[PDB]
Design a protein around this ligand. Structure first.
Ligand code: FE
Ligand code: NA
Length: 207
């Protein structure tokens, strides 16, 4: 019945995300969202709820408009960061597994087509935000979309999130400074967790 900072799935992602950067992003930014949300939900319908309710809280707070905006920003950021950490692994990146190949090829023309769409989307999100690989139920295909600030596919009907890459400047600044492209390159090359993507498409019954 309080929000908590959930454990990382790994000890680190060096040398791609430095020890210092991981510490500041996780124990600094992500931890602070958890603290702030605990403070904000007091006296509201969300008091005494835990991490499993985060998805529900995001949608309800967003629908509330002005009354729910701070709660939305913080709940959404916690949910987004949890998703981000699961979206990477040590020895990640590279080509998708065999069981994903056709869907990737169908949706983006080729692996290189995917890398290009993902990179374009990341450099295209002006200011703070997130890049998502999603399954679009109406297109019957994978898509790349970006969101501003704390927005996510939880806000959009028919769009199942599969992986995310944080493009808030704090996600990469300490290691890559203003070179967001260098960080995006590294994400695709060595971080993206295809086991997570695949596992979620299997859970949703898509594959
Ligand atoms: Fe972040
Ligand atoms: Na959705």
């Amino acid at each position: 019945s309080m929000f908590e900072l959930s454990d990382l799935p790994y000890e680190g992602l060096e040398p791609y995300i430095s020890s210092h950067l991981l510490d500041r992003h996780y124990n600094g930014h992500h931890k602070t969202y958890v603290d702030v949300l605990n403070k904000l939900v007091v006296g509201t319908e969300f008091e005494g709820l835990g991490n499993e309710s985060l998805g529900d809280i995001v949608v309800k707070a967003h629908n509330s408009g002005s009354a729910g905006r701070a709660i939305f920003n913080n709940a959404a950021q916690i949910w987004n960061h949890d998703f981000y950490w699961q979206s990477m692994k040590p020895n990640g990146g590279g080509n998708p597994p065999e069981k994903l190949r056709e869907m990737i090829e169908h949706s983006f023309g080729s692996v290189e087509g995917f890398n290009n769409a993902f990179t374009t989307s990341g450099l295209g999100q002006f200011g703070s935000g997130w890049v998502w690989l999603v399954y679009d139920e109406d297109a019957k295909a994978l898509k790349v979309v970006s969101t501003a600030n704390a927005d996510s596919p939880l806000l959009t009907q028919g769009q199942l999130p599969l992986a995310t890459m944080d493009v808030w400047e704090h996600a990469y600044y300490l290691d890559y400074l203003n070179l967001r492209k260098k960080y995006i390159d590294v994400f695709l090359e060595h971080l993206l967790n295809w086991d997570f993507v695949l596992g979620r498409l299997e859970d949703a019954g898509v594959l």
